[PDB]
Structure 1
Amino acid sequence: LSGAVTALILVIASVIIALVVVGFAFGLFGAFTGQGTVAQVGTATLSASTLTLTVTLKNTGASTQV
């Protein structure tokens, strides 16, 4: 009688664990998609007297830092 009890306990535990793993995978998807993609969309201007960089940047992801 213990065999079937063990079988169902393991079945439900395995289902819980598999659902956890799948949720983590889809979270990884959503997190890597919106991670932050920064590129340049036009020439920069480097003032050499004051050493100041004026650059136009395009960022279609999360708000990152420099």
Structure 2
Amino acid sequence: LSGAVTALILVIASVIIALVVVGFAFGLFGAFTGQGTVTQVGTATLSAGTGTLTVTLKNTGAATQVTGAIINGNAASVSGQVTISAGQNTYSISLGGISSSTLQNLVGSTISLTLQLSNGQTVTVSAIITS
């Protein structure tokens, strides 16, 4: 009599476990699709006198936040409007840890930027240097 009881106990347990795994997979699907996608729209004028980006990031997910930036192969620090709101907006972020002598000489030229986002993906930014 033990064989049948064991069979049904294991069958019910397997049904429960399979349902749990399938539900977890679908929940992971939902979590990943709305994970937060951030891209660059338009240019990003960068000031050289003090250092203040004017990037225009368009995000279609969770309200993430920038955690850092890379300038000339150096780890910078970001302060300002650091909280990335949902929806396309004009953001005024301020960089840090750059000497105001190298960047000042490049007024009117273009460089390439990267923002260190909190959801694990970086965004490449093209910039115009301005006074």
Measured against the shorter chain, the TM-score band is over 0.9
1:31 Cα deviation from its structure 2 partner: 0.3
1:50 Cα deviation from its structure 2 partner: 1.3
Mark the runs of 5 or more structure 2 residues left unpaired by the alignment: 65-130
CA–CA separation in structure 2 for the residues paired with 1:13 and 1:53: 57
% identity of equivalent residues: 92
CA–CA separation in structure 2 for the residues paired with 1:6 and 1:26: 30
1:49 Cα deviation from its structure 2 partner: 0.3
Aligned length: 65
- After superposition, the C-alpha distances for 1:12-54 in whole angstroms (9 at most, x for unaligned) are 0000000000000000100000000000110001000011101
Corresponding position: 1:35 with 2:16: no
Name 1:11's counterpart in structure 2: 11
CA–CA separation in structure 2 for the residues paired with 1:55 and 1:14: 52
The structure with the greater share of residues assigned to helix is: 1
> What's the secondary structure of 1:53's corresponding residue?
coil
> What's the secondary structure of 1:45's corresponding residue?
strand
CA–CA separation in structure 1 for the residues paired with 2:11 and 2:52: 63
Name 2:52's counterpart in structure 1: 52
CA–CA separation in structure 2 for the residues paired with 1:55 and 1:11: 57
CA RMSD of the aligned region, Å? Answer: 3.0
CA–CA separation in structure 1 for the residues paired with 2:51 and 2:37: 26
CA–CA separation in structure 2 for the residues paired with 1:51 and 1:3: 75
Name 2:21's counterpart in structure 1: 21
Q: Which runs of 4+ in 1 moved over 4 A?
A: none
> What's the secondary structure of 2:26's corresponding residue?
helix
